[PDB]
Ligand binder design. Structure first.
Ligand SMILES: *[C@@H]1O[C@H](CO)[C@@H](O[C@@H]2O[C@H](CO)[C@@H](O[C@@H]3O[C@H](CO[C@H]4O[C@H](CO[C@H]5O[C@H](CO)[C@@H](O)[C@H](O)[C@@H]5O)[C@@H](O)[C@H](O[C@H]5O[C@H](CO)[C@@H](O)[C@H](O)[C@@H]5O[C@H]5O[C@H](CO)[C@@H](O)[C@H](O)[C@@H]5O)[C@@H]4O)[C@@H](O)[C@H](O[C@H]4O[C@H](CO)[C@@H](O)[C@H](O)[C@@H]4O)[C@@H]3O)[C@H](O)[C@H]2NC(C)=O)[C@H](O)[C@H]1NC(C)=O
Ligand SMILES: *[C@@H]1O[C@H](CO)[C@@H](O[C@@H]2O[C@H](CO)[C@@H](O[C@@H]3O[C@H](CO[C@H]4O[C@H](CO)[C@@H](O)[C@H](O)[C@@H]4O)[C@@H](O)[C@H](O[C@H]4O[C@H](CO)[C@@H](O)[C@H](O)[C@@H]4O[C@@H]4O[C@H](CO)[C@@H](O)[C@H](O)[C@H]4NC(C)=O)[C@@H]3O)[C@H](O)[C@H]2NC(C)=O)[C@H](O)[C@H]1NC(C)=O
Ligand SMILES: *[C@@H]1O[C@H](CO)[C@@H](O[C@@H]2O[C@H](CO)[C@@H](O[C@@H]3O[C@H](CO[C@H]4O[C@H](CO)[C@@H](O)[C@H](O[C@H]5O[C@H](CO)[C@@H](O)[C@H](O)[C@@H]5O)[C@@H]4O)[C@@H](O)[C@H](O[C@H]4O[C@H](CO)[C@@H](O)[C@H](O)[C@@H]4O)[C@@H]3O)[C@H](O)[C@H]2NC(C)=O)[C@H](O)[C@H]1NC(C)=O
Ligand SMILES: *[C@@H]1O[C@H](CO)[C@@H](O[C@@H]2O[C@H](CO)[C@@H](O[C@@H]3O[C@H](CO[C@H]4O[C@H](CO)[C@@H](O)[C@H](O)[C@@H]4O)[C@@H](O)[C@H](O)[C@@H]3O)[C@H](O)[C@H]2NC(C)=O)[C@H](O)[C@H]1NC(C)=O
Ligand SMILES: *[C@@H]1O[C@H](CO)[C@@H](O[C@@H]2O[C@H](CO)[C@@H](O[C@@H]3O[C@H](CO)[C@@H](O)[C@H](O)[C@@H]3O)[C@H](O)[C@H]2NC(C)=O)[C@H](O)[C@H]1NC(C)=O
Ligand SMILES: *[C@@H]1O[C@H](CO)[C@@H](O[C@@H]2O[C@H](CO)[C@@H](O)[C@H](O)[C@H]2NC(C)=O)[C@H](O)[C@H]1NC(C)=O
Ligand SMILES: *[C@@H]1O[C@H](CO)[C@@H](O)[C@H](O)[C@H]1NC(C)=O
Ligand SMILES: *[C@@H]1O[C@H](CO)[C@@H](O)[C@H](O)[C@H]1NC(C)=O
Ligand SMILES: *[C@@H]1O[C@H](CO)[C@@H](O)[C@H](O)[C@H]1NC(C)=O
Lengths: 320, 98, 346, 66
């Protein structure tokens, strides 16, 4: 459509001033490009610790879930002498494997561009124009000259002085929808396990599904072949397969039956995050250096990693 | 005295005349879009509606060029649009599935 | 022509040249977007395209969707901006529509489209309309309006140079299009300038004209003075404070911000007229040619002399005639005019 | 070659207003007065109907608008 129009119309000089000088043009252009884009700084650089994630609150395949990207399947056919240690390290086959890219030692900041972490003041039932004004006022009220957010803006998990004035808290089901966000931003890892063995929970120690562990341990891991120790051999897993049930730890998390749930915390990062607003920075820097320069400068910063964070699907747009 | 004349002015050199023939065939469209026999009806209705409306207001004009039926490009494209993927296989001799 | 490229041949003439062979086009090949859509999403996208096409053809426009830009530009050999102009002004004709096959599940149709593409020789952007205000003259008792027949209708000024255009055989297809455009010189009394004819016409006294100009000034031509403004010569008038002149309110304009000007600046010109021009315009009763811009004293005089001489003294209107002789003689010999006036009133 | 027309910027002067409401001012004259600042408009904000549509339905609605 746009090209067709472009192809028949020449340019005309109009005797008003340059839009680049006008505040409404500056403010609306920084908004259309950087409204929801924020930079978070760790107190110091500390990655997610483990490669294997136990997270039974998520349903398994058998809607789609984003965490199924990291799900390890259990396969009945394997090569000879095959072991999980050889491929997924210390992950439990049938759970989730976190790649080394998400666990970089030197990552000091997290850049994200999404609306999904705002506290109650934000509602998609309200109008675009209203939500704009509400954000625009909050970002003025939460900032003094610079682009650094006041600690008040943050959730309690990222700062002692956080009062959720801009951002909500991350919850237990957020891992299933938004994996990367949790892995990069959570200050602590919390498990949620219905696996027989964890927290020493033995099958006797219980003081259609009922009181049962989802996956029980088997004797060992093994394979057997028939003069063909290469391609196709039967595999016997160290734990059960959840394919038949698939809803168990989800339906357990929503309490529809009692069960022996296990939860353990593990600290990762100090609760002293700092947050910058790229929208507020765009407004501010454009007063000194003009918008053309600032816009091009900040657009390159969204591509620091080589993929521009703003073109990613909304829920998955988190980068260290 | 004088006033502006905002509109451009073009000096003519020559005119070039062209004839273009547009050909439409709903089966080609219905194959690609994996359409069902029900939606093939909708496509056929929708196309006739638009084409008939145009047909109803426009009379016929003689254009002083040779007949398209004599032109290769017309022949090639018509045979294609119709028969491109149509083939005839002959058995060595007639033998059915047993 | 065997190729579109041939249209650029220098030893052609201004006319219509047809490409010899028909362009053949299948819609299924043209509309890529539908090819990847499925079910009713495909159907509705096509409906939008077909309805658009129909809309363009009713307005005699060309829907360029069904022709390759690059191919056309590579055949025509033209700049990006020239192609914009070419594609704006080109017009379409439907010479046949034909259903070729009809089944309850399947149809086919054919359409014959004829296009005429104007090829530009030149394009002019910064243009002014002319307006001819003339001058008033008082002569042997008669008020006369005098005008020069200018040989151009447009002034153009792209950058610095100012050009005077005569146009012929024009039409509007968004822009103005003309067959013939002749560059001309302004009027003057010299070899290098145009020798334009001068027209006179008798007019009723008092004559007042006041045109409010858009920028806030007023254009005045009046037989009489008011607010200091000289009579007979026209002028562009501006005031610092609202006042009444000629029975209407000349307002102070609003302050404006300055910008780069493209206003023309015509040559000045001195024009001699016949001594009795007011009488010559009067006895005709119509707007009449009196001189040319360049014309010699001798040729200017021998023009109306026989006519004027045959306005001789008659038994029936001697007093009237004597009064006209006094008005004619006043400026030449005042002492004879006062005498003739006295005899006339006697 | 690069075209651009001065057809609306030929005269070398411009009369401007701070507010659309100013156009009603009695002691103006017949002429062209420009509002001094550009109106700035996002289409996302302007088309509410597409905001609550989803998938190819949203896309086809916008196509009809454009
Ligand atoms: C509403 O709209 C109307 C317009 O539609 C507005 O009216 C217009 O307002 C303009 C002001 O913005 C006026 O322009 C001004 O004209 C003045 C008068 O110009 C004439 O005199 C000049 C001086 O002549 C004497 O002195 C010289 C020596 O210096 C002697 O040689 C002479 O004998 C005299 O003694 C003279 O230079 C001008 O000559 C040019 O114009 C005539 C035709 O008018 C041509 O015959 C000439 O060829 C010549 O034009 C060519 O050369 C000049 C440079 O020499 C170029 O600029 C031209 O483009 C062209 O190539 C006239 O005889 C000017 O004095 C005055 O000058 C100011 O600006 C210049 C810079 O541009 C400065 O350097 C000066 O110092 C000074 O500040 C200016 O040009 C228009 O006349 C007027 N239009 C009409 C038709 O009336 C109206 O006001 C608007 N109202 C509102 C409310 O907005
Ligand atoms: C990313 O970061 C977010 C935080 O922003 C994090 O979300 C939090 O996740 C934790 C862990 O699931 C949530 O806390 C748990 O909530 C359970 C439900 O709370 C109700 O019950 C308590 C009282 O029981 C009430 O006070 C409360 O108001 C609710 O009504 C709660 O049962 C959990 O408590 C058990 O576990 C903790 C673990 O430290 C323990 O301290 C408690 O005493 C309690 O006992 C333990 O129970 C488990 C089994 O249930 C057993 O294994 C263990 O042996 C027991 N230990 C003891 C000592 O008895 C716990 O409070 C928290 O609410 C979430 N916050 C939000 C904002 O949602 C995500 O999980 C993080 N994601 C990842 C992947 O890291
Ligand atoms: C366009 O431009 C032309 C050229 O300027 C205008 O015509 C001229 O007008 C002027 C002013 O009225 C005339 O000036 C007078 O000239 C005579 C002398 O004329 C004789 O000598 C000239 C020498 O160059 C010669 O050109 C003349 O030839 C013309 O006339 C003869 C005779 O009829 C004819 O045969 C030719 O074919 C030519 O047509 C001629 O031989 C001079 O005596 C006058 O003196 C008076 O004015 C001066 C100055 O005020 C004063 O000092 C004296 O005391 C005296 O009062 C005066 O200079 C000129 O003759 C005109 N030339 C022509 C060719 O007509 C023309 O009118 C302009 N047109 C328009 C429409 O405005
Ligand atoms: C009739 O013609 C007049 C010319 O004879 C017009 O007067 C000119 O109007 C301009 C309007 O912009 C004045 O500019 C103002 O100047 C003062 C200060 O004066 C000093 O600076 C100017 C140039 O800025 C200089 O020209 C002066 O000589 C002084 O040195 C500023 O405070 C204003 O902001 C504004 O710039 C001209 O000064 C003035 N010139 C003359 C010669 O009068 C008049 O406006 C026309 N009026 C009508 C009824 O049309
Ligand atoms: C109309 O229906 C056909 C048949 O279903 C559609 O073609 C199919 O399209 C899919 C997706 O492009 C193809 O699957 C992919 O094939 C590649 C190559 O093998 C493989 O790498 C992928 O893993 C995946 O399997 C599928 O092969 C293809 N089937 C056929 C028979 O061509 C078609 O897209 C539909 N189109 C429309 C517009 O209705
Ligand atoms: C984001 O950054 C990447 C990496 O620097 C840019 O990708 C390069 O782009 C150039 C320009 O055409 C190519 O020639 C290179 O081959 C690309 N290299 C890689 C590693 O992709 C990319 O252009 C940037 N994109 C945006 C939208 O900013
Ligand atoms: C990480 O930082 C350390 C200390 O500066 C350095 O030795 C190492 O090369 C860095 N590695 C990467 C992957 O950045
Ligand atoms: C039992 O629980 C404690 C909790 O700290 C742990 O240290 C120990 O390793 C567990 N032992 C077994 C046999 O699971
Ligand atoms: C940019 O450089 C100019 C001098 O070239 C200087 O005046 C200006 O203050 C600098 N800073 C900004 C924000 O433009």
């Amino acid at each position: 459509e746009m090209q067709s129009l472009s192809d028949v119309m020449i340019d005309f000089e109009i005797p008003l001033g340059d839009p680049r000088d006008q505040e409404q043009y500056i403010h609306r252009k920084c908004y259309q490009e950087f409204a929801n884009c924020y930079l978070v700084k760790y107190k110091e650089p500390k990655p997610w610790p483990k490669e294997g994630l136990i997270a039974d609150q998520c349903p398994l395949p058998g809607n789609r879930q984003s965490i199924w990207d990291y799900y390890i399947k259990v396969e009945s056919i394997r090569p000879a002498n095959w072991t999980t240690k050889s491929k997924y390290g210390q992950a439990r086959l049938g759970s989730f494997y976190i790649p080394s890219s998400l666990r970089q030692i030197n990552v000091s900041h997290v850049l994200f561009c999404s609306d999904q972490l705002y506290s109650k003041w934000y509602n998609i039932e309200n109008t675009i124009e209203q939500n704009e004004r509400f954000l625009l006022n909050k970002l003025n009220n939460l900032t003094s000259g610079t682009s650094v957010l006041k600690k008040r803006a943050l959730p309690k998990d990222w700062s002692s002085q956080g009062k959720n004035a801009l951002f909500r808290e991350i919850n237990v089901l957020d891992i299933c929808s938004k994996p990367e966000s949790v892995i990069l931003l959570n200050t602590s890892y919390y498990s949620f396990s219905l696996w027989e063995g964890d927290c020493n929970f033995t099958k006797d120690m219980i003081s259609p599904y009922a009181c049962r562990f989802w996956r029980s341990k088997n004797e060992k891991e093994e394979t057997k072949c028939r003069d063909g120790e290469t391609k196709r051999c039967l595999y016997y897993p160290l734990w059960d397969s959840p394919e038949s049930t698939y809803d168990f730890g989800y339906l357990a998390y929503q309490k529809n039956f009692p069960s022996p749930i296990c939860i353990e915390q593990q600290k990762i990062r100090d609760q002293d995050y700092e947050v910058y607003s790229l929208y507020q920075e765009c407004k501010i820097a454009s007063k000194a250096y003009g918008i053309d320069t600032v816009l091009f400068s900040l657009k390159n910063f969204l591509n620091y990693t080589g993929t521009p964070v703003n073109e990613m699907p909304n829920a998955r747009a988190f980068v260290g | 005295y004088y006033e502006p004349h905002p509109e451009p002015i073009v000096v003519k050199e020559r005119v070039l005349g062209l004839s273009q023939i547009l050909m439409i065939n709903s089966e080609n469209i219905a194959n690609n879009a994996n359409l069902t026999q029900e939606v093939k009806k909708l496509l056929t209705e929708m196309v006739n509606e638009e084409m008939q409306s145009l047909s109803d207001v426009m009379i016929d004009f003689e254009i002083p060029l040779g007949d398209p039926r004599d032109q290769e490009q017309y022949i090639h494209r018509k045979c294609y649009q119709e028969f491109a993927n149509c083939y005839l296989v002959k058995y060595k001799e007639p033998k059915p599935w047993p | 022509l065997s190729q579109i490229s041939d249209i650029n041949d220098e030893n052609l003439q201004q006319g219509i040249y047809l490409l010899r062979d028909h362009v053949i086009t299948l819609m299924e090949a043209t509309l890529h977007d539908i090819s990847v859509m499925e079910g009713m999403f495909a159907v509705q996208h096509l409906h939008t395209h077909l309805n658009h096409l129909k809309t363009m053809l009713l307005e005699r426009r060309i829907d360029w969707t069904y022709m390759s830009s690059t191919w056309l530009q590579q055949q025509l050999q033209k700049s990006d901006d020239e192609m914009k102009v070419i594609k704006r002004i080109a017009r379409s004709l439907v010479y046949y529509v034909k259903q070729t096959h009809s089944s309850p599940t399947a149809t086919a149709w054919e359409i014959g489209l004829y296009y005429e593409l104007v090829i530009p020789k030149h394009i002019y952007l910064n243009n002014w309309n002319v307006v001819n205000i003339g001058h008033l003259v008082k002569s042997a008792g008669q008020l006369t309006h005098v005008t020069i027949a200018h040989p151009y209708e447009i002034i153009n000024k792209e950058c610095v140079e100012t050009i005077y255009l005569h146009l012929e055989d024009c039409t509007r297809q968004d822009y103005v299009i003309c067959d013939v455009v002749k560059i001309v010189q302004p009027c003057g009394n010299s070899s290098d300038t145009s020798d334009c004819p001068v027209w006179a016409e008798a007019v009723k006294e008092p004559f007042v004209q006041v045109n409010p100009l858009k920028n806030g000034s007023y254009l005045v031509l009046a037989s009489s003075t008011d607010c200091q403004i000289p009579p007979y010569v026209p002028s562009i008038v501006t005031v610092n404070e609202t006042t009444s002149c000629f029975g209407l309110d000349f307002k102070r304009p609003l302050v404006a911000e300055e910008r780069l000007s493209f206003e023309p600046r015509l040559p000045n010109l001195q024009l001699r007229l016949p001594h009795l021009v007011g009488i010559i315009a009067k006895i005709k009763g119509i707007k009449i040619e009196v001189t040319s811009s360049g014309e010699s004293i001798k040729e200017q005089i021998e023009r109306a002399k026989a006519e004027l001489l045959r306005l001789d003294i008659h038994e029936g209107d001697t007093p009237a005639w004597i009064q006209q002789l006094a008005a004619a003689t006043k400026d030449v010999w005042p002492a004879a005019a006062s005498a003739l006036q006295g005899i006339g009133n006697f | 070659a690069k075209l651009r027309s001065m057809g609306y910027a030929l005269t070398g002067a411009v009369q401007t207003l701070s507010q659309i409401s100013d156009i009603n001012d009695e002691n103006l004259q017949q002429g062209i007065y420009l509002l001094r600042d550009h109106v700035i408009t996002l289409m996302e904000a302007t088309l509410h109907d597409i905001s609550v549509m989803e998938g190819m339905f949203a896309v086809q609605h916008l196509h009809t608008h454009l």
